Design an enzyme around this catalytic site. Structure first.
Site, PDB file in Angstrom:
ATOM      1  N   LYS A 204      19.724 -25.668 -10.235  1.00  0.00           N
ATOM      2  CA  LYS A 204      20.698 -25.188  -9.237  1.00  0.00           C
ATOM      3  C   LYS A 204      22.048 -24.953  -9.888  1.00  0.00           C
ATOM      4  O   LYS A 204      22.286 -25.325 -11.064  1.00  0.00           O
ATOM      5  CB  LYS A 204      20.632 -26.072  -8.000  1.00  0.00           C
TER       6      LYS A 204
HETATM    7  C1  DCS Z   1      16.027 -23.672  -0.230  1.00  0.00           C
HETATM    8  C2  DCS Z   1      15.800 -25.038  -0.829  1.00  0.00           C
HETATM    9  N1  DCS Z   1      16.033 -26.083  -0.019  1.00  0.00           N
HETATM   10  C3  DCS Z   1      15.843 -27.313  -0.512  1.00  0.00           C
HETATM   11  C4  DCS Z   1      15.397 -27.568  -1.817  1.00  0.00           C
HETATM   12  C5  DCS Z   1      15.215 -28.982  -2.257  1.00  0.00           C
HETATM   13  O1  DCS Z   1      16.333 -29.346  -3.042  1.00  0.00           O
HETATM   14  P1  DCS Z   1      16.252 -30.663  -3.855  1.00  0.00           P
HETATM   15  O2  DCS Z   1      15.442 -30.378  -5.076  1.00  0.00           O
HETATM   16  O3  DCS Z   1      17.631 -31.060  -4.223  1.00  0.00           O
HETATM   17  O4  DCS Z   1      15.637 -31.724  -3.010  1.00  0.00           O
HETATM   18  C6  DCS Z   1      15.153 -26.492  -2.684  1.00  0.00           C
HETATM   19  C7  DCS Z   1      14.677 -26.739  -4.108  1.00  0.00           C
HETATM   20  N2  DCS Z   1      15.543 -26.331  -5.163  1.00  0.00           N
HETATM   21  C8  DCS Z   1      15.316 -25.324  -6.009  1.00  0.00           C
HETATM   22  C9  DCS Z   1      15.878 -25.066  -7.398  1.00  0.00           C
HETATM   23  O5  DCS Z   1      14.951 -24.135  -7.960  1.00  0.00           O
HETATM   24  N3  DCS Z   1      14.315 -23.478  -6.881  1.00  0.00           N
HETATM   25  C10 DCS Z   1      14.225 -24.322  -5.851  1.00  0.00           C
HETATM   26  O6  DCS Z   1      13.647 -24.119  -4.797  1.00  0.00           O
HETATM   27  C11 DCS Z   1      15.366 -25.188  -2.147  1.00  0.00           C
HETATM   28  O7  DCS Z   1      15.147 -24.048  -2.893  1.00  0.00           O
END
Ligand code: DCS
Length: 364
Positions: free
Chosen positions: A180
């Site tokens: 991220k």
């Molecule tokens: C839209 C979205 N919401 C929530 C999450 C969950 O975040 P956490 O990992 O912090 O719990 C992600 C995952 N993150 C990424 C980073 O790479 N692509 C993903 O979907 C996400 O893409």
């Protein structure tokens, strides 16, 4: 020389930040968490912030804090990470998936409003890929019907909507996962404008402990973010404009390069905003390109180029296919079979960039 779709921007400051925490002896939740919370409030313009172990965890405690459970419905797009759907289901509630705009992949006010019922207890829009969703229209709906809005801002650290940072008002959840915009490997933070809601979040991410000496007030989970990881997020947060500018730059080249290629990037929303450029997604329609999405992904990988899939819609995954067999969402499905994320990270060089572009041409 494998080129992954993403790489964290880790430098001397991240290591120095860890060293100071290690030498201090206070490695779990303490002063660094407090600083990270104060900084996210400063960054967004919001009044309260609760740091947690992941954005999934933040989603869990946010929905839980709303008292969501059995019989309650939660509106959310299917075009999003499965974590949200899993948290709604695991709490005993019913997820009501709606379609998204065919070119921006964002949940529209119309799709949301057609699914509202007296059982709707939350609405969760996703600021997709770095761009913001239609907040004015979404909050209006929220205010009209008396339904809480919980923004999924995992791709939006640095995103702005109509001159206002995502998270300034309302409730927004950000992510510090490894790929991220800012990262501490795993982590997240819930930014909100409600003090009672904030207090419930603080307690639910730490065993439901609270002062009535702390004791269990109502059972909670263990989702606290260590100071070790919070110090890395703080160092990353200090470099946000520079990192985002490097992402934006690369998006422009991609944009330019796409004019000569048959792949279709997402459309920018029409309202005013600032794009964090978390991902650079392209659609790969077999007819138009002569190659399918899966084939391109496999092709690019032969060349040592990694790509991402954001996302295989939630409703097309095993558990959800079997529970909602008749659910159909055309724009979501159309995009789900065609999208892929090309390499985009702050340390990506033109050797990298250009390499991706001469692999796509080869392919098309
Ligand atoms: C839209 C979205 N919401 C929530 C999450 C969950 O975040 P956490 O990992 O912090 O719990 C992600 C995952 N993150 C990424 C980073 O790479 N692509 C993903 O979907 C996400 O893409």
């Amino acid at each position: 020389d494998f080129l992954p779709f993403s790489r964290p921007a880790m430098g001397a400051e991240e290591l120095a930040a860890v060293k100071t925490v290690l030498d201090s002896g206070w490695i779990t939740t303490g002063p660094k968490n407090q600083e990270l919370e104060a900084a996210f409030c400063r960054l967004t313009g919001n009044q309260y912030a609760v740091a947690v172990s992941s954005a999934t965890a933040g989603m869990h405690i946010a929905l839980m804090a709303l008292g969501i459970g059995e019989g309650d419905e939660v509106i959310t797009p299917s075009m999003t990470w499965v974590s949200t759907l899993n948290m709604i289901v695991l709490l005993g509630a019913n997820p009501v998936m709606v379609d998204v705009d065919r070119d921006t992949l964002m949940v529209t006010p119309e799709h949301i409003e057609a699914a509202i019922t007296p059982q709707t207890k939350a609405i969760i829009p996703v600021h997709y890929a770095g761009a913001p969703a239609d907040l004015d229209a979404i909050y209006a709906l929220g205010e009209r019907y008396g339904i809480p809005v919980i923004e999924d801002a995992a791709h939006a650290t640095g995103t702005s909507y109509k001159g206002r940072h995502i998270g300034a008002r309302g409730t927004a959840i950000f992510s510090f996962h490894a790929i991220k915009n800012i990262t501490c490997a795993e982590g997240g933070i819930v930014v909100t404008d409600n003090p009672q809601f904030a207090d419930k979040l603080r307690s639910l991410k730490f065993h439901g402990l609270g002062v009535d000496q702390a004791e269990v007030l109502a059972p909670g989970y263990k989702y606290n973010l260590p100071d070790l990881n919070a110090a890395i997020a703080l160092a990353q947060l200090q470099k946000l404009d520079a990192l985002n500018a490097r992402r934006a730059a690369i998006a422009a080249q991609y944009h330019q390069a796409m004019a000569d290629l048959p792949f279709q990037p997402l459309s920018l929303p029409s309202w005013e905003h600032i794009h964090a450029w978390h991902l650079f997604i392209i659609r790969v329609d077999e007819a138009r390109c002569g190659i399918t999405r899966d084939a391109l992904m496999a092709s690019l990988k032969t060349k040592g180029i990694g790509t991402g899939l954001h996302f295989r819609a939630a409703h097309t995954q095993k558990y959800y296919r079997e529970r909602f067999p008749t659910l159909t969402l055309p724009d979501t499905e159309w995009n789900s079979e065609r999208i892929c994320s090309l390499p985009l990270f702050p340390d990506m060089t033109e050797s990298d960039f250009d390499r991706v572009i001469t692999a796509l041409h080869q392919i098309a």
